[PDB]
From Swiss-Prot, chain A:
Keywords: Glycoprotein, Host cytoplasm, Host nucleus, Host-virus interaction, Phosphoprotein, Virion, Virion tegument. Phosphorylated by host CCNA2. The keyword Kinase does not apply. GO terms for cellular component: host cell cytoplasmic vesicle; host cell nucleus; host cell perinuclear region of cytoplasm; host cell viral assembly compartment; viral tegument. It comes from Human cytomegalovirus (strain AD169) (HHV-5). This is Large structural phosphoprotein. The gene is UL32. It is found in: Virion tegument; Host cytoplasm; Host nucleus. Interacts with host BICD1 and RAB6A. Interacts with small capsid protein UL48A; this interaction links together the capsid and pp150. Interacts with host CCNA2.
Swiss-Prot record, chain B:
It is found in: Virion; Host nucleus. Belongs to the herpesviridae major capsid protein family. The chain holds residues 540 to 588 of 1370 of the full protein. Self-assembles to form an icosahedral capsid with a T=16 symmetry, about 200 nm in diameter, and consisting of 150 hexons and 12 pentons (total of 162 capsomers). Hexons form the edges and faces of the capsid and are each composed of six MCP molecules. In contrast, one penton is found at each of the 12 vertices. Eleven of the pentons are MCP pentamers, while the last vertex is occupied by the portal complex. This is Major capsid protein. Homomultimer. Makes the hexons and eleven out of twelve pentons. Interacts with triplex proteins 1/TRX1 and 2/TRX2; adjacent capsomers are linked together in groups of three by triplexes, heterotrimeric complexes composed of one molecule of TRX1 and two molecules of TRX2. Interacts with scaffold protein; this interaction allows efficient MCP transport to the host nucleus. Interacts with capsid vertex component 2/CVC2. Interacts with the small capsomere-interacting protein/SCP. The gene is MCP.
Swiss-Prot record, chain D:
This is Small capsomere-interacting protein. Participates in the assembly of the infectious particles by decorating the outer surface of the capsid shell and thus forming a layer between the capsid and the tegument. Complexes composed of the major capsid protein and small capsomere-interacting protein/SCP assemble together in the host cytoplasm and are translocated to the nucleus, where they accumulate and participate in capsid assembly. Keywords: Capsid protein, Host nucleus, Virion. The keyword Secreted does not apply. The gene is SCP.
Length: 284, 49, 49, 63
């Protein structure tokens, strides 16, 4: 459990409870919650102590966020089965020039998840590029031939209101990536060919996966940058005094914190022998 | 050269302002060195300072 | 020791921090205590040279 | 007895001479709390001895 310096018990417990409630919190970024950042001791405490408190807050927030790191196995299975559906529908379609059609159907056939978080967003992007090209071929519409360009990841022949609703839902997932709402099933069968319906469902699921992975990575890198900055500043400040407690604290902060595992080890080291270096931090 | 301009390919032609810009295949490095030796000899700097 | 090292066999050295657990495990085989730094590619080639 | 546990560590584990004690030596005084918690690992004494060496080293480093 986190161990701040100089904070009144009410402030510590409300801060801990906010880190506990993180999933329920819409707009889940600390940068969007200045209610929490000044709780560290802004202008109330000394420089070293407020730096230490803010590093503790960022590190604990990173740990809880990494705990809630979303499992997408359900939507990954849905994506794979939808991709199989799109490939199945695509092979029967009477494309005029079957060569490019079968190339894009092959790349749509091959896509499989390799059980690693980072790879799946990029493989999903490739699969959606192929499927959108295939759907645009089916409706005999133009497509990007300029070299260096690539077909955008866009819905084919969906109505304005449904694209608007889907993009607002995706933005809601962007705000809070823990409450998954894949509920956009509203695709009536009278309009559009079956292939375009399948492609629209597939592109929706793929875009949901990509958005959630992108938001996760951006928050992860923000946390790593902030904790690295805090470690740098606090080491620079502790360097000025050569005592056992000060040297011990500098040695603890000396670790690189550019990985989630390294953040865990730094946090656990700071916690376990907190009572050695505490006297270096003034508590007024 | 052939180049890209707002999603089109276009042709671009510009002058080689100096002799150095000829390719190493068509005017290699050793040729430039020997030409410099010739210039130095013309200036009477063949054994240089 | 026997199996390829997973990223959770490898553990970091705590320089300047009290490190009795690692000091007991000096003759151990599996955890392979390592520094946090990793050698860059260029200095890796220099080491090999 | 905290005194008994600290005495056990200092004499049995650390074999420290009677010249040097927890009350006198300050780095020892701060490390004894952490060393008492490790009830095991007591049979291997060179681990604790080396740790005390490097703790006074980190105390004395002017950098």
């Amino acid at each position: 459990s986190l161990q701040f310096i100089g904070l009144q018990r009410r402030d510590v417990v409300a801060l801990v409870n906010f880190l506990r409630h993180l999933t329920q919190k819409p707009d889940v970024d600390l940068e969007a919650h200045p209610k929490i950042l000044k709780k560290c001791g802004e202008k109330r405490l000394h420089r070293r102590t407020v730096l230490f408190n803010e590093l503790m807050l960022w590190l604990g927030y990173y740990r809880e966020l990494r705990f809630h790191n979303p499992d997408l196995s359900s939507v990954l299975e849905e994506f794979e089965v939808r991709c199989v559906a799109v490939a199945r529908r695509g092979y029967t379609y009477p494309f005029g020039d079957r060569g490019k059609a079968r190339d894009h159907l092959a790349v749509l056939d091959r896509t499989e998840f390799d059980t690693d978080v980072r790879h799946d967003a990029e493989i999903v992007e490739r699969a959606l590029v192929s499927a959108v090209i295939l759907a645009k071929m089916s409706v005999r519409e133009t497509l990007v031939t300029a070299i260096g360009q690539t077909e955008p990841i866009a819905f084919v022949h969906l109505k304005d209101t449904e694209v608007q609703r889907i993009e607002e839902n995706l933005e809601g997932v962007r705000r809070n990536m823990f409450c998954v709402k894949p509920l956009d099933l509203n695709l009536d069968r009278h309009a559009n060919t079956a292939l375009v319906n399948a492609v629209n469902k597939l592109v929706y699921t793929g875009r949901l996966i990509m958005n959630v992975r992108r938001s996760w990575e951006e928050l992860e890198r923000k946390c790593l940058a902030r904790i690295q900055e805090r470690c740098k500043l606090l080491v620079k400040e502790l360097r000025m005094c050569l005592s056992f407690d000060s040297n011990y604290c500098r040695n603890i902060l000396k670790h690189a914190v550019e990985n989630g595992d390294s953040a865990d080890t730094l946090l656990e080291l700071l916690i376990e022998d907190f009572d050695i270096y505490v006297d270096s931090f003034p508590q007024s | 050269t052939h180049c890209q301009e707002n999603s089109e390919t276009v042709a671009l032609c510009t002058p080689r302002i100096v002799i150095g810009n000829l390719p190493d295949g068509l005017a290699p490095g050793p040729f430039h060195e020997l030409r410099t030796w010739e210039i130095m000899e013309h200036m009477r700097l063949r054994p240089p300072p | 020791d026997r199996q390829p090292l997973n990223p959770a066999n490898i553990e970091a050295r705590h320089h300047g921090v009290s490190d009795v657990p690692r000091l007991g495990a000096m003759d151990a085989d599996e955890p392979l205590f390592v520094d946090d730094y990793r050698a860059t590619d260029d200095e890796w080639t220099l080491q090999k040279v | 007895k905290r005194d008994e546990k600290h005495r056990h560590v200092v004499n049995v584990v650390l074999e420290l001479p009677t010249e040097i004690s927890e009350a006198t030596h300050p780095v020892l005084a701060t490390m004894l709390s952490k060393y008492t918690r490790m009830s095991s690992l007591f049979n291997d004494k060179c681990a604790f001895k080396l740790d005390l060496l490097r703790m006074v080293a980190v105390s004395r480093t002017r950098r």
